[model samples]
Target: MKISIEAHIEQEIEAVWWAWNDPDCIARWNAASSDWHTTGSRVDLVVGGRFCHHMAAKDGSAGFDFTGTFTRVEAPTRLSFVMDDGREVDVQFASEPGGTWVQETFDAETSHTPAQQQAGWQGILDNFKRYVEAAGLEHHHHHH
Candidate 1:
């Protein structure tokens, strides 16, 4: 079965899109919990291109790269990819009056239960929301 999760990113599509595509931005907030962090990332926002994020524990104990190939990409709106482990993921950026709603639906992997999968994905999305919106706030502060 497919599992889904989403978070409301409190910014215009343009800003959220920028943050989403930027590897530097990905480094700022990519982990689901306090024990982990994303040390680096490489982004190629194009169809048939590859993207990867290096995630590691804060203690420097162990880590690995989460890599994927982009299967579908529409700038500022949607993206879909097949992860290295063979799970399919689709991300939609839906624009509303006040902000963009980012929804992600992915194939549930056999290794984890659906609830576990949803929670972890939701945590990551929530972190993305906080990261992008907080950056947007900082940008506005600097401009005015």
Candidate 2:
């Protein structure tokens, strides 16, 4: 049972992509209920290159690290990677009138439960939305 989720965000594709690639931005919006701090990250942003992220709970109680090498990359449009655990993820982004539409798909066999996995991923997406929106507002305010 593959898990696929879609979200509409009021941010440009470039903005969203930049946030995704930036380690500081990722730390602000990667996890669901728990805080995620990326201790280290490397993103090659090209096919055959790798992206790695080390995330830890805010309280420093628990953590995990994951890395994936790009299987496909089409910049601001599509991205696909195979994780160290053999799971694959594909993410698609499309420009919308006011923002962008993001679609993400993950290999199901890597998930312990469909519901739990969906919730976790959805939480991350929600965080992304909030982060981008807030950043946009801040930018607007600064420019004015």
Candidate 3:
């Protein structure tokens, strides 16, 4: 099964791309729920480069790395990577009139149902939109 999700980010494409590609920015919006978080991340952003986002429960109970190797990169527009388990994932970004549109699809794992996986991924995508939109709005207000 594959889980796919989309988010409309009310920010410029460049800002959206930076948030998606930059590890520090990744940590800010990568968690699916309030009880979990991506505490740190590393990215090389090229074909064959490996990336990892360290995730943990806020109560200090569990932790793991969401690690993958890049198989495709298309600048701000698209990227795909293969997980350690051999499953592939894709992320696409498109410039819309009002903002950037981001779509993600990934192979579903056995531990969770496809719907559960989709919801989790969608939550993180929603967070991404909120983070980038707020930051860009604040930046605009600060300079004006």
Candidate 4:
């Protein structure tokens, strides 16, 4: 089965896209919970290029690498990749009147229930939205 999650971020597509693609930004906002974080991340954003994000517990108890190769890359709009375990993921970015809506649909693995998978991915998406919007708010406060 496939699972999808989405978040509407109150920021422009360019800024939202940058936060999503930048490795440093990934490490900062890629966690699903307070006790987990992405310690490292790398992105070679191009067709056939590879990317990896090292997600780990803050307690240093467990971790895993989320690695994938790009299959499609349409800047600030869409991205598609096949993960190391053969699951495929597609992400869409739509520019709305006031912000951007980002959605991701991915192949679900059997090890986890559909609800678990959905919640995990949704949590990550929510984190991403907050990260970008918070940055925008900070920048907004710095100007006239």
Which regions in candidate 4 have their CA more than 4 angstroms from the true location?
137-144
lDDT of 2 by residue, 43-140 (tens): 78888999887787878998887788999999888789888877688888888886788898877655377678778778878887788886773322
How much lDDT does candidate 3 score?
A: 0.81
Candidate 3: residue 103 lDDT (0-100): 84
The lDDT of model 2 is 0.77
By lDDT: ranked, best first: 4, 1, 3, 2
- For candidate 3, report its TM-score: 0.85
Please tell me which predicted candidate would have the highest TM-score against the true structure.
1
Task: Pull out the clashing pairs in model 1.
Answer: none
TM-score of each: 0.89, 0.84, 0.85, 0.88
Error of 2 at 30 (Å): 1.4
lDDT of each: 0.83, 0.77, 0.81, 0.84
TM-score, candidate 1, is 0.89
* Residue lDDT tens for model 4, 50-117: 99999889889999788989999999899899888776888899889867889899998767687887
Clashes of 3: 0
**Per-residue lDDT of 46-101 in model 1, one digit per residue for the tens?**
89999999988899898877799999899889989888877798989999875788
